[PDB]
Amino acid sequence: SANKTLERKLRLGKKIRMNKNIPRWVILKDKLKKRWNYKRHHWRRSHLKL
């Protein structure tokens, strides 16, 4: 909604900042086999419950 508490707003803020891929220089520095971050979410499919 457009009328939220700051407490709910801060927990949703962290979810957005975390929805990122694995950086390219990290994949090769650590010699990673699996190159996708499976803790990502999509707004049309998820239920954050926050």
Partner RNA sequence: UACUCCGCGCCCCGGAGGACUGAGGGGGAGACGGGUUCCGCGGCGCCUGCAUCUGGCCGCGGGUGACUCGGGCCUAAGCGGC
Partner RNA sequence: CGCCCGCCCCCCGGCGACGCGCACGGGGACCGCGGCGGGCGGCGCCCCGGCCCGCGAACGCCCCGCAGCCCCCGGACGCCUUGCGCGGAGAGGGGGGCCCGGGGGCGGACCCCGCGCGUCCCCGGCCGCCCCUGAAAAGCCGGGGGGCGCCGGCCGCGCGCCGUACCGACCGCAGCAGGACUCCGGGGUCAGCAGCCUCUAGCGCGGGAGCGAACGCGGCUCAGGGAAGUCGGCAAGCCGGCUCCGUAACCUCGGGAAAAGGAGUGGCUCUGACGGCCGGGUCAGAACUGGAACGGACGCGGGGAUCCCGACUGUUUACUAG
| 3 token code pair | 């009328």
Q: What angle do CA 36, 12, 22 make, to 5 degrees?
A: 15
Closest contact distance (angstroms) between CB of 13 and RNA is 8
Select the residue interacting with RNA from 26, 28, 32, 50 (CB under 7 A): 50
Residue 38, amino acid: Y
Site for RNA in 7-46 (CB under 7 A): 8-9, 12, 15-16, 19, 21, 41-46
Q: Measured between alpha carbons, how far is 32 from 13 in angstroms, rounded to an integer?
A: 29
Binding site for RNA (CB under 7 A): 1-6, 8-9, 12, 15-16, 19, 21, 41-50
